[PDB]
């Protein structure tokens, strides 16, 4: 997250870190046994880390649970990042409390102008690299489809939305991928891609979760 703020420990209780010996992507806990993340974060041998703030220090609220199954969206296209969404089933159910909690799926799509919370442990610089140990947060609006399509001609599908600031300065970044975009208490987006980070006229692009709720529910019900 570039241009954000320190969230505070366990203030984003649905945020997960995906770990394969190191943090590599975010995710969101959607019930006691399932995480949603980005398909481009797919790896074998994922450990899901819940209740994290500082990802390098054991602080006392963590739960570390191995993945039993990962399901990339059937139509994920790694070249265009269309359908950049994946489900991860945990080996055992998480213990839910005030600091580890699921986030609700949306029952509508969020409009342009809605304010959302984006979070992650990704890079905090637009030039160079500095990775934080504690969770960072950013409040950002959903942009109109027309501004989004004007920013990224020929690249935005119906399964994507833009959020952030056309002026630049404030954005998600490398290492935030897979993480949540939460608006009005619902999961509306997944950190997916962008051109650089926090660059002028290059807002973040997010997987539009409301298009996937049927697939998510059906998949969870049968796996
Ligand atoms: Ca920790």
Swiss-Prot record:
Example GO molecular function: serine-type endopeptidase activity
Assigned GO CC terms: extracellular space; serine protease inhibitor complex
The protein's required cofactors: Ca(2+)
CDD domains to which the protein is assigned, alphabetical: Tryp_SPc (cd00190)
Reactions this protein catalyses: Preferential cleavage: Arg-|-Xaa, Lys-|-Xaa
Regulation acting on activity, per entry: Is inhibited by scorpion cyclotide trypsin inhibitor TopI1.
UniProt KW keywords: Calcium, Digestion, Disulfide bond, Hydrolase, Metal-binding, Protease, Secreted, Serine protease, Signal, Zymogen
Localization per record: Secreted, Extracellular space
Tissue occurrence: Synthesized in the acinar cells of the pancreas.
EC number: 3.4.21.4
Residue numbers binding substrate: 171-172, 174-175, 177
A Pfam family annotated for this UniProt entry: Trypsin
Annotated Ca(2+) binding sites: 52, 54, 57, 62
InterPro entries registered for this protein in UniProt: Peptidase_S1_PA, Peptidase_S1_PA_chymotrypsin, Peptidase_S1A, Serine_Proteases_S1, Trypsin_dom, TRYPSIN_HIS, TRYPSIN_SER
Coiled coil: none
Record PTM text: Subsequent cleavage after Lys-125 leads to alpha-trypsin. Further cleavage after Lys-170 yields pseudotrypsin. A cleavage may also occur after Arg-99.
PROSITE patterns (UniProt xref): TRYPSIN_DOM, TRYPSIN_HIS, TRYPSIN_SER
GO biological process per UniProt: digestion; proteolysis
Disulfide bonds: 7-137, 25-41, 109-210, 116-183, 148-162, 173-197
Active-site feature positions: 40, 84, 177
Domain Peptidase S1, residue spans: 1-221
Subunit structure: Interacts with SERPINA1.
PANTHER family, alphabetized: RIKEN CDNA 2210010C04 GENE (PTHR24264:SF15), TRYPSIN-RELATED (PTHR24264)
Family, similarity comment: Belongs to the peptidase S1 family.
Official protein name in the record: Serine protease 1
Organism expressing this protein natively: Bos taurus (Bovine)
Lineage of origin: Eukaryota, Metazoa, Chordata, Craniata, Vertebrata
